[PDB]
Design a protein around this motif. Structure first.
Motif, PDB file in Angstrom:
ATOM      1  N   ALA A   1      10.504  -0.665  -6.290  1.00  0.00           N
ATOM      2  CA  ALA A   1       9.414  -1.354  -6.304  1.00  0.00           C
ATOM      3  C   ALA A   1       8.015  -0.574  -7.111  1.00  0.00           C
ATOM      4  CB  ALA A   1       8.591  -1.818  -4.932  1.00  0.00           C
ATOM      5  N   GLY A   2       8.025   0.598  -6.698  1.00  0.00           N
ATOM      6  CA  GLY A   2       7.082   1.604  -7.382  1.00  0.00           C
ATOM      7  C   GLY A   2       7.327   1.612  -8.983  1.00  0.00           C
TER       8      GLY A   2
ATOM      9  N   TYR B   1      -3.010  -2.912   1.019  1.00  0.00           N
ATOM     10  CA  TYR B   1      -3.087  -3.135  -0.473  1.00  0.00           C
ATOM     11  C   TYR B   1      -2.673  -4.489  -0.905  1.00  0.00           C
ATOM     12  CZ  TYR B   1      -4.561  -2.343  -5.166  1.00  0.00           C
ATOM     13  OH  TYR B   1      -5.108  -2.133  -6.460  1.00  0.00           O
ATOM     14  N   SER B   2      -3.478  -5.486  -1.482  1.00  0.00           N
ATOM     15  CA  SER B   2      -3.070  -6.660  -2.017  1.00  0.00           C
ATOM     16  C   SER B   2      -3.491  -6.864  -3.399  1.00  0.00           C
ATOM     17  CB  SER B   2      -4.018  -7.791  -1.535  1.00  0.00           C
ATOM     18  OG  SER B   2      -3.964  -9.057  -2.113  1.00  0.00           O
ATOM     19  N   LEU B   3      -2.635  -7.040  -4.517  1.00  0.00           N
ATOM     20  CA  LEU B   3      -2.566  -7.083  -5.853  1.00  0.00           C
ATOM     21  C   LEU B   3      -3.688  -8.227  -6.194  1.00  0.00           C
ATOM     22  CD1 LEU B   3      -0.553  -5.047  -6.254  1.00  0.00           C
ATOM     23  CD2 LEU B   3       0.687  -6.446  -7.970  1.00  0.00           C
TER      24      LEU B   3
ATOM     25  N   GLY C   1       0.937  -1.128  -0.007  1.00  0.00           N
ATOM     26  CA  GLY C   1       0.013   0.176  -0.079  1.00  0.00           C
ATOM     27  C   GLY C   1       1.010   1.368   0.182  1.00  0.00           C
ATOM     28  N   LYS C   2       1.915   1.181   0.830  1.00  0.00           N
ATOM     29  CA  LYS C   2       2.933   2.353   0.667  1.00  0.00           C
ATOM     30  C   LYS C   2       3.597   2.551  -0.634  1.00  0.00           C
ATOM     31  CE  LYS C   2       7.168   3.321   3.173  1.00  0.00           C
ATOM     32  NZ  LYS C   2       6.566   4.297   4.150  1.00  0.00           N
ATOM     33  N   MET C   3       3.821   1.567  -1.351  1.00  0.00           N
ATOM     34  CA  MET C   3       4.403   1.573  -2.917  1.00  0.00           C
ATOM     35  C   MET C   3       3.312   2.199  -3.719  1.00  0.00           C
ATOM     36  SD  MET C   3       3.763  -0.814  -5.800  1.00  0.00           S
ATOM     37  CE  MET C   3       4.263  -2.621  -5.016  1.00  0.00           C
ATOM     38  N   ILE C   4       1.960   1.634  -3.595  1.00  0.00           N
ATOM     39  CA  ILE C   4       0.953   2.339  -4.359  1.00  0.00           C
ATOM     40  C   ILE C   4       0.691   3.702  -4.007  1.00  0.00           C
ATOM     41  CG2 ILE C   4      -1.585   2.139  -4.859  1.00  0.00           C
ATOM     42  CD1 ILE C   4       0.148  -0.225  -5.885  1.00  0.00           C
ATOM     43  N   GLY C   5       0.815   4.160  -2.793  1.00  0.00           N
ATOM     44  CA  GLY C   5       0.461   5.588  -2.236  1.00  0.00           C
ATOM     45  C   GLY C   5       1.529   6.161  -2.927  1.00  0.00           C
ATOM     46  N   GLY C   6       2.798   5.978  -3.134  1.00  0.00           N
ATOM     47  CA  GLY C   6       3.876   6.873  -3.641  1.00  0.00           C
ATOM     48  C   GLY C   6       3.914   7.032  -4.857  1.00  0.00           C
TER      49      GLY C   6
END
Ligand code: A1CEF
Length: 457
Positions: free
Chosen positions: A110-111, A275-277, A11-16
């Motif tokens: 990762a982002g 967040y889960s893909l 979720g931190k990756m998605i958020g960024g």
């Protein structure tokens, strides 16, 4: 207990990515419509991949000339009810600053790989790889195993997970062929560099095989002193088997930055919520999103919507009869779609361009996998012909025979649908599964009767 931390780190990756997108839309003065335009999203995503790439072909593929300290592409703006295109050049250093600033000081590699995998999924839903396959001496009918075949040349372990058996075989066969034509490809320092890459790709492919015999065959391929025709045949035999004896290829549902952006903009805390893909997160997010696309005068908006829907869902390689039930509308093979790719080439007239609201929603959602109702989907005609092509007497082996036997017993069993069923989007807990009803009149493969352009740029 531990899976909670994996959801938060995802979720931190998605958020960024969303914090980054908002910052770029703001820097570029893009309106709400412009920022939701998927062509604008693609250029922005390519600019950040480019800024960190340093011309290594690790995050993206590009063409050399221009200033290596700058980067850019097409930004589309709406002026007087009409679409216009500008080519902007943005300092690579400033893009990196904005990326790290959006990721609270982190490099957040990762982002970048998540945006790269979204790009790979879009290409798998858009371009055909038939000529690429025939150029390497592979059967063009391997098309259904070409997951992530457009991933950047020197992409790491990030892309390894999403690559198909056909992509691994293509890349391994390309190396074996180079060394057959030129034995010097394995000698010297370049040879040492290549042998290390050979063994790593062999183990990456071996990891995708789900049987002892398929894996044991990859051991023989990896440990061959001077790879040649013997290894080429074993590799194509293994690709034929992966049509019946399915490998373990990860399909990640990575969405464009123009989806994560508005979600962060309206206050979603991806780090806190998690967040889960896999599961409802990509589906629920696509229900609460609105994306626009530039449409060509001859394109069907429903068909451009399906292409983007399939790319978001990493589903170009899934059974269309399954996709149709989950989506709640018939998913057509690529050959039956009246649309070209999402990207707009520079030789295109912008005065002819229009925009469309992409219909990215789904009727149901499902998870990628006590008593079940046996629901089977017959294997596609082209995949049966491709799988049972090569002669048994051609090149013999004990591992070859066991794989043949395994294929011959799996074939009458056909393709069994896996999982409890599909779920309503309101059912976020996945407690009330729905009985899946499939249409066997429709074909199973997205690549059946394929008329898509060949990937080149
Ligand atoms: C060969 C057989 C018949 C074997 O049995 C399974 C069946 C495929 O069943 C699926 C396929 C894909 C998803 C799926 C999952 C996600 C996800 N995030 O979990 C997503 O984003 N999109 C999707 C998508 F529909 F769009 F593809 C869910 C279930 O194929």
């Amino acid at each position: 207990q531990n899976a909670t931390e994996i959801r938060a780190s995802v979720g931190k990756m998605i958020g960024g990515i969303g914090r980054f997108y908002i910052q770029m839309c703001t820097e570029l003065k893009l309106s709400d419509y412009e920022g939701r335009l998927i062509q604008n999203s693609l250029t922005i995503e390519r600019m950040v991949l480019s800024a960190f790439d340093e011309r290594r072909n690790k995050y993206l593929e590009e063409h050399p000339g221009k200033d290596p300290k700058k980067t850019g592409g097409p930004i589309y703006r709406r002026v007087n009810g009409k679409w216009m295109r500008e080519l902007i050049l943005y300092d690579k250093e400033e893009i990196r600053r904005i990326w790290r600033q959006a990721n609270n000081g982190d490099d957040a590699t990762a982002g970048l790989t998540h945006m790269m995998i979204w790009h790979s999924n879009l290409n798998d839903a858009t371009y055909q790889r038939t000529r690429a396959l025939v150029r390497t001496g592979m059967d063009p009918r391997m098309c259904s195993l070409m997951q992530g075949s457009t991933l950047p040349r020197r992409s790491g372990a990030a892309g390894a997970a999403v690559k198909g058996v056909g992509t691994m075989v293509m890349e391994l066969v390309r190396m074996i062929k180079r060394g057959i034509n030129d034995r010097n490809f394995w000698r010297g320092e370049n040879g040492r560099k290549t042998r290390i890459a050979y063994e790593r790709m062999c183990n990456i492919l071996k990891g995708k095989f789900q049987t002892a015999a398929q894996k044991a065959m990859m051991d023989q391929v990896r440990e061959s002193r001077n790879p040649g025709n013997a290894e080429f045949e074993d590799l194509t035999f293994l690709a034929r088997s992966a049509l019946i004896l399915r490998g373990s290829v990860a399909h990640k549902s990575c969405l464009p930055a123009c989806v994560y952006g508005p979600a962060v903009a309206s206050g979603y805390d991806f780090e806190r919520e998690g967040y889960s893909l896999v599961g409802i997160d990509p589906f629920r997010l696509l229900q609460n999103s609105q994306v626009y696309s530039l449409i060509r005068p001859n394109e069907n908006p429903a068909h451009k919507s399906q292409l983007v829907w399939m790319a978001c869902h990493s589903a170009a390689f899934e059974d269309l009869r399954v996709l149709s039930f989950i989506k709640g509308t018939k998913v057509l093979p690529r050959g039956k779609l009246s649309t070209r790719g999402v990207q707009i080439a520079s030789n295109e007239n912008m005065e002819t361009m229009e925009s469309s609201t992409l219909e990215l929603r789904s009727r149901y959602w499902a998870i990628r996998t006590t008593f079940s109702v046996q629901r089977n989907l017959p294997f596609d005609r082209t995949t049966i012909m491709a799988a049972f092509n090569g002669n048994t007497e051609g090149r013999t082996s004990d591992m070859r025979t066991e794989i043949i036997r395994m294929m011959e017993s799996a074939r009458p069993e056909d393709v069994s649908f896996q999982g409890r069923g599909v779920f309503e989007l309101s059912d976020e807990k996945a407690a009330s599964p729905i009985v899946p009803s499939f249409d066997m009149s429709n074909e199973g493969s997205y690549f059946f009767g394929d008329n898509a352009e060949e990937y080149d740029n």
